[PDB]
């Protein structure tokens, strides 16, 4: 009956492009509970307020968590044309969203550091001609098409990863370029929260 945030606290977290996403329905939550754990460093919402999001009822609650370095905080949100928003992670304009930047305290054993921070600097599909490139920009709430060709972690900064598309797919190539950022002393993470509205169920409401 209580929302299970446990997968977040166990194991090694995914990078921004391949972020693990949890969907909650029919359960009660104590957001306070989550951020109690972490040394939060930023916490902004759009179309909702930080106080309101933890004290309202929704059809569904969606939580994205991933490894993200604070150094790149500017790039991550909103206006910035930095690839992060272009090719890696975009939040919904239409619905109320929150973006949380936090740091894993030393007391948290359970989470595991990644080798490094990885992200896609560019994602493009090349036509059969192999001259014509059609940039693939991610939609909100959706995953870069290059997640299929890019590694759990970029092996090395400046690596190119490419795949060839079955003639069923129209041929040509799917081409991505990756970048890396050295791991911090403490793992820094990003959390993305979004909620959805439905007639039948407002079954995601705060535990009391």
């Amino acid at each position, epitope marked *: 009956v209580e929302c299970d945030f446990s997968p977040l606290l166990s194991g090694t977290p*995914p990078q921004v492009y391949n972020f693990k996403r949890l969907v909650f329905t029919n359960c009660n939550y104590n957001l306070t509970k989550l951020l109690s754990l972490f040394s939060v460093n930023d916490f902004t919402c759009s179309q909702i307020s930080p106080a309101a999001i933890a004290s309202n009822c929704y059809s569904s609650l969606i939580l994205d968590y991933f490894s993200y370095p604070l150094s790149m905080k500017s790039d991550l949100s909103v206006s910035s044309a930095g690839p992060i928003s272009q090719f890696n992670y975009k939040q919904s304009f239409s619905n109320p969203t929150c973006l949380i930047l936090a740091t894993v305290p030393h007391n948290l054993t359970t989470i595991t550091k990644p*080798l490094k921070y990885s992200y896609i600097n560019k994602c493009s599909r090349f036509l059969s001609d192999d001259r014509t490139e059609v940039p693939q920009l991610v939609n909100a709430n959706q995953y870069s098409p290059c997640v299929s060709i*890019v*590694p*759990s972690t970029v*092996w*090395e900064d400046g*690596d*190119y*990863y490419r795949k060839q598309l079955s003639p069923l797919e129209g041929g040509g190539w799917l081409v991505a370029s990756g970048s890396t950022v050295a791991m911090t002393e403490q793992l820094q993470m990003g959390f993305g929260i979004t909620v959805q509205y439905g007639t039948d169920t407002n079954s995601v409401c705060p535990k009391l």
Partner: antibody
Amino acid sequence: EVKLVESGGGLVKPGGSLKLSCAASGFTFSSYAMSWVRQTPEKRLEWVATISSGGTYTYYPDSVKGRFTISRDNAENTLYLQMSSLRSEDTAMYYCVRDGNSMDYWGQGTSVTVSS
Amino acid sequence: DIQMTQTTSSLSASLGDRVTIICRASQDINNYLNWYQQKPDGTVKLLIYYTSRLHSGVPSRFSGSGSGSDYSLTISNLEQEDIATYFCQQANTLPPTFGAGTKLELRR
């Protein structure tokens, strides 16, 4: 197509050393990561080492770490594996492989045996 | 280390059959699963990458699907030349880990 041809395999006494080579062609060598994957007598498959397109980064399983060194030469277009302190465990088929998310192509392998 | 279990070691099927093989993993692997086929002569080719993606030069009888920690490989309309041992690999973390294989024989 592309081609990967391993060489250097043979018999070596325990604690001894040996260096394998892999001749790459038909693709741009510099641009892909490279790995060594070995198959044991049981037909088990176990990763051995991987190296970045740059040659900058390396990774090894704990079991093989510190005894095996993986190097590449982009100009040469060959991938080398250098091994030391060999034990009977290490006997396997050895495959040049091309990495990424998945191993794109595999070499036909070279057979390495460690025994007295 | 993440442990990959191929539920079945060996199969029998007849030409034109559809058979399905499934790797299962120790931990959730975020979709990064590959399939490789080893022919008897010892030649390994990569059938499938990222669970559903299909390697070039590889025909579309082979299809893959799954998520979380259970993924499956499907071959259809089997052919003689499909006889081989098929491996599943996982690339979420390091070190990659592999399956023990699934041996396909066909019925004649």
